[PDB]
């Protein structure tokens, strides 16, 4: 009955410009992690950067920097992005780390000793300028997507992993574990993939061609395929196989990814785990695309790119986090825009929540001597204590938008209760009843603020302070009525959600 939660995000190309996609996935993982910690779970939230491969290496060379020095520097870009977005991760794994190198080599050794490795010839269309192979689909009308020049058929010796050997097992595993891959649409997509041969996987290239990475333990002349290397970050960060973190968190592994890297996580990864004798992960949670304002995929080409940091700068971290979690159903392609963020901010935060907090403080000073009144039963508002129980399953099923919707609906109810009861009228002849109404709203806000904490950590803590409530909270405190203590509220408090 030990409550454990482990969530990972994809480790991103280290020199990549952090974008809305990176931001969304990480914000969702952060909500999940924060929510479980709030609910008393022993939690581990992993993030990181993929720092190997020839692309990274050539980027460093082009930048005129030593490769290790290059990645040491550029990796800070993602760390900066997570700080800006208020991501409370437990570890930021960089694939250049020694512990990662050792795990990748140990796992390769295991797969090798399992007899799943063989040396073979890789043949296909090649670009001698990129120094890499390209499928006909990756080409831009038969031309290298990078140099815009024709490609040529070349061959190369690589070591291969007998991935096909595990297809029957994987197919059956997914069939017998309906909730492994969510949402369901992606599961079907993967099943379609596994209906046909998946073949063997090239897990290395000559160092002569790819000189930046982890060497194969049986052949130092070859470097491990970037995907094999990168995928293992999920267990190397737990210090597999002796780390207690591995024993603790791997049994509950949740992987969050965008649909663009589905095959590697739903096909490659599972077969690698099985071959290495490592248990399967618990859930693969697949997100959709965050489309541009015009409903089309984002691209400089189209001019519909929405910059997350531009949004964060203008409306604030919590407003952005809230918007993404409230308006983007995890798993389905959804268009985003500054206009939608602004409307959501003005309606839900500035109006519904912020102004209620403002008016409540005003009425407390006016009718309650600037203090929270003596606790009274919740009456119609007491049902707010049941929201946590209703939200737990929604969160676990990736329905963050529904969860936030329910929490905010309660916030709306608190507003109507105020307008309905009118404490300013009750005070004329029955001040005790007026104060009782004010207590109910304050206690209701306390509860609502806890439910919203995983989405807006700093703002909910600020809201709590504005009402003189206990700042640090636990989800269980949202399930009992009457915890707000009759104490004075701060003489002054900045505007929680200022107009933009």
Q: Is 297 a catalytic residue?
A: yes
What are the angstrom distances between the C-alpha of 373 and each of 187, 309, 369, 442, 489? 53, 41, 9, 9, 11
C-alpha to C-alpha distance for 24 and 330, rounded to whole angstroms:
10
Residue 147 marked in a binding site: yes
Q: Is 147 a catalytic residue?
A: yes
Q: Is 165 a catalytic residue?
A: no
Please report how close the Cβ of residue 326 comes to Zn ion at its closest, in angstroms. Answer: 42
Identity of the residue, 108 or 127, whose beta carbon is nearer to Zn ion in the bound complex: 127
Please report how close the Cβ of residue 227 comes to Zn ion at its closest, in angstroms. Answer: 20
Identity of the residue, 144 or 363, whose beta carbon is nearer to Zn ion in the bound complex: 144
Identity of the residue, 125 or 305, whose beta carbon is nearer to Zn ion in the bound complex: 125
Catalytic residue selected from 79, 102, 110, 130: 130
Please report how close the Cβ of residue 136 comes to Zn ion at its closest, in angstroms. Answer: 14
Contacts of 279 (CB under 8 A, 6+ apart): 250, 251, 273
Catalytic residue selected from 147, 155, 422, 500: 147
Please report how close the Cβ of residue 50 comes to Zn ion at its closest, in angstroms. Answer: 21
Please report how close the Cβ of residue 300 comes to Zn ion at its closest, in angstroms. Answer: 20
Catalytic residue selected from 36, 100, 144, 265: 144
Identity of the residue, 130 or 305, whose beta carbon is nearer to Zn ion in the bound complex: 130
Q: Is 130 a catalytic residue?
A: yes
Q: Is 255 a catalytic residue?
A: no
Please report how close the Cβ of residue 146 comes to Zn ion at its closest, in angstroms. Answer: 4
Binding residues for Zn ion, rule: CB under 5 A, are: 127, 129-130, 144, 146-147
CA neighbor of 267 nearest in space, from 372, 394, 174, 349? 174
Q: Is 283 a catalytic residue?
A: no
Identity of the residue, 80 or 149, whose beta carbon is nearer to Zn ion in the bound complex: 149
Identity of the residue, 145 or 185, whose beta carbon is nearer to Zn ion in the bound complex: 145
- Tokens read off for 129: 């300028």
Binding site for ATP: which residues?
A: 300
Catalytic machinery residues: 19, 22, 127, 130, 144, 147, 297, 300
Binding site for Zn(2+): which residues?
A: 127, 130, 144, 147
Binding site: which residues?
A: 127, 130, 144, 147, 300
């Amino acid at each position: 009955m030990e409550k454990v939660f482990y969530v990972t995000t994809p480790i991103y190309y280290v020199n990549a410009e952090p974008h809305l996609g990176h931001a969304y996935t990480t914000v969702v993982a952060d909500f999940l992690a924060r929510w479980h910690r709030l609910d008393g779970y022993r939690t581990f939230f992993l993030t990181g950067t993929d720092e190997h491969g020839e692309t990274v290496y050539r980027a460093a060379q082009a930048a005129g920097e030593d490769p290790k020095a290059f990645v040491d520097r550029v990796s800070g870009r993602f760390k900066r992005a997570w700080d800006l977005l208020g991501i409370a991760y437990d570890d930021f794994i960089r694939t250049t780390e020694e512990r990662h190198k050792k795990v990748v080599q140990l796992v390769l050794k295991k797969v090798y000793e399992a007899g799943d490795i063989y040396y073979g010839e890789y043949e296909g269309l090649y670009c001698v300028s990129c120094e890499r192979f390209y499928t006909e689909k990756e080409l831009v009308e038969g031309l290298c997507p990078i140099h815009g020049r024709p490609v040529e058929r070349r061959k190369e010796g690589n070591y291969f992993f007998r991935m096909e050997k595990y297809r029957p097992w994987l197919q059956e595993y997914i069939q017998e574990n309906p909730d492994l891959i969510r949402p369901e649409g992606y599961r079907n997509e993967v099943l379609a993939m596994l209906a046909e041969p998946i073949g063997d996987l090239s897990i290395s290239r000559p160092k002569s061609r790819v000189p930046w990475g982890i060497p194969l333990p049986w052949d130092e002349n070859h470097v491990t395929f970037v995907w094999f290397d990168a995928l293992l970050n999920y267990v190397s960060a737990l210090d597999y196989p002796e780390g207690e973190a591995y024993r603790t968190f791997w049994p509950h592994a949740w992987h969050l990814i965008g649909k663009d890297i589905l095959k590697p996580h739903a096909v490659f990864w599972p077969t690698m785990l099985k071959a290495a004798g490592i248990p399967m992960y618990r859930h693969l949670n697949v997100g959709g695309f965050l489309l541009g304002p015009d409903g089309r995929k984002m691209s400089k080409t189209l001019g519909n790119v929405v910059d997350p940091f531009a949004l964060l700068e203008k409306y604030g971290r919590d407003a952005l986090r809230y918007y993404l979690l409230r308006e983007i159903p995890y798993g389905q392609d959804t268009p985003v825009s500054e206009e939608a963020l602004r409307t959501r901010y003005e309606a839900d935060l500035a109006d519904d929540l912020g102004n209620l907090v403002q008016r409540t403080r005003a009425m407390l000073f006016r009718f309650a001597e600037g203090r929270i009144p003596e606790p009274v039963a919740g009456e119609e508002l007491a049902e707010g204590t049941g929201l946590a129980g209703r939200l737990r399953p929604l969160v676990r099923e990736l329905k963050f938008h529904v969860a936030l919707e329910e929490a905010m609906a309660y916030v709306k109810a608190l507003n109507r209760y105020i307008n309905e009861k009118k404490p300013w009228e009750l005070f004329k002849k029955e001040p005790e009843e007026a104060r009782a109404v004010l207590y109910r709203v304050v206690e209701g806000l306390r509860i609502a603020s806890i439910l919203l904490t995983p989405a807006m950590p700093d703002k909910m803590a600020e809201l709590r302070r504005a009402l003189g409530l206990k700042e640090e909270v636990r989800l269980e405190e949202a399930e009992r009525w009457g915890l707000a203590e009759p104490r004075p509220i701060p003489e002054e408090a900045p505007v929680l959600f200022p107009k933009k």
